[PDB]
Design an enzyme around this catalytic site. Structure first.
Site, short mmCIF file in Angstrom:
data_model
loop_
_atom_site.label_atom_id
_atom_site.label_comp_id
_atom_site.label_asym_id
_atom_site.label_seq_id
_atom_site.Cartn_x
_atom_site.Cartn_y
_atom_site.Cartn_z
N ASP A 180 3.22 6.90 2.18
CA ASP A 180 3.32 5.70 3.05
C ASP A 180 1.94 5.34 3.61
OD1 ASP A 180 6.09 5.47 2.66
OD2 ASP A 180 6.44 5.16 4.79
N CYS A 214 2.22 -3.33 -7.07
CA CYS A 214 2.58 -2.55 -5.86
C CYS A 214 3.20 -3.61 -4.94
CB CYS A 214 1.34 -1.80 -5.41
SG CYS A 214 -0.15 -2.81 -5.28
N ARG A 220 -3.08 -0.21 -4.76
CA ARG A 220 -2.66 0.84 -5.73
C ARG A 220 -2.78 0.30 -7.16
NH1 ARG A 220 2.89 2.53 -2.56
NH2 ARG A 220 1.90 2.72 -0.50
N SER A 221 -2.40 -0.95 -7.39
CA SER A 221 -2.45 -1.61 -8.73
C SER A 221 -3.90 -1.60 -9.24
CB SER A 221 -1.93 -3.02 -8.69
OG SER A 221 -0.54 -3.08 -8.34
N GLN A 261 -8.21 -1.82 -1.74
CA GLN A 261 -7.99 -2.43 -0.40
C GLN A 261 -8.76 -1.66 0.67
OE1 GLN A 261 -3.50 -3.05 -0.58
NE2 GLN A 261 -4.04 -4.69 0.84
#
Ligand code: JHJ
Length: 281
Positions: A180, A214, A220-221, A261
């Site tokens: 998370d 994602c 994450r992608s 990110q």
């Protein structure tokens, strides 16, 4: 060599500094189609938009818009579609894109619920006997089989074009253990997952581009594509240490904004590539 560059940045704790240098060097192209008022409810986040030049167009005359970008890595001969987690109202558009682009694999790097909020619509069937029909795009989706492991699930799906009665097999690769908050401690399970996608043939030029998502389709992608492309380039080049992650990331950012990110995701990408290089040398 990136292993030495890693220790430098790590020992000096300069991850936020390099990350900022990448943010400032990154391309900025128009995203006019994404900002049209009629497309407001097709975007999960108002600050995450595909560039007009690289956006995927749906083959529907009404509204061709989906929040999705084609990443083309010419030297690596790899292409990826990065997209947001579908919304309740865009699940049919998502599967239309998969159909139209002749994709063989979908790579999902999020859970449907994270931090107590929905990150994604449930866009695939949970049981064999309960198929989904997308009336808006005239597609039927059936779960054929599901193989649940500790770190990821692979699902075989049948996608049927109700208009022409053609069917295709789609592979759904679902990485289920990204935490998370922050990034995995070790890149081992992520590398294992990446090699499993490769082994399926989903990343191969016989097929349309893999669809990777994602929640926003940038963080994450981004790590997924960056690691795959960097490891590929290390197999292809006479000198594997000529591969500069930072340069590869800036190239991908010409195609979709914001890939990677956080400074943590950048550090994790270095670690995945450094570690993956040992299984490739
Ligand atoms: C004052 O605002 C600035 C913030 C960051 C930079 N760039 C930077 O620190 N690069 C770096 C590369 C490798 N190791 C350590 C650092 C420049 C100015």
């Amino acid at each position: 060599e990136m292993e030495k560059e890693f220790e430098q940045i790590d020992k000096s704790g300069s991850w936020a500094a390099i990350y900022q240098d990448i943010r400032h060097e990154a391309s900025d192209f128009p995203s006019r189609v994404a900002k049209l008022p009629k497309n407001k409810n097709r975007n999960r986040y108002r600050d995450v938009s595909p560039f007009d030049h690289s956006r995927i167009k749906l083959h529907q005359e009404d509204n061709d818009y989906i929040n999705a970008s084609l990443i083309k890595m010419e030297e690596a001969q790899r292409s990826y579609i990065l997209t947001q987690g579908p919304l309740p109202n865009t699940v049919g558009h998502f599967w239309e894109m998969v159909w139209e682009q002749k994709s063989r694999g979908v790579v999902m790097l999020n859970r449907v619920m994270e931090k107590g909020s929905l990150k994604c619509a449930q866009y695939w069937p949970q049981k064999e006997e309960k198929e989904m029909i997308f009336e808006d795009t005239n597609l039927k989706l059936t779960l054929i089989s599901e193989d649940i492991k500790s770190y990821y699930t692979v699902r075989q799906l049948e996608l049927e074009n109700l208009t022409t009665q053609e069917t295709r097999e789609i592979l759904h690769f679902h990485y289920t253990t990204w935490p998370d908050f922050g990034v995995p401690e070790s890149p081992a399970s992520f590398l294992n997952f990446l090699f499993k996608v490769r082994e399926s043939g989903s990343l191969s030029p016989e097929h349309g581009p893999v669809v990777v998502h994602c929640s926003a389709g940038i963080g994450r992608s981004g790590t997924f594509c960056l690691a795959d492309t960097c490891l590929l380039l290390m197999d292809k080049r006479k000198d594997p240490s000529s591969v500069d992650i930072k340069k590869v990331l800036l190239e991908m950012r010409k195609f979709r904004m914001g890939l990677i990110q956080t400074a943590d995701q950048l550090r994790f990408s270095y670690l995945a590539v450094i570690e993956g290089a040992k299984f490739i040398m």
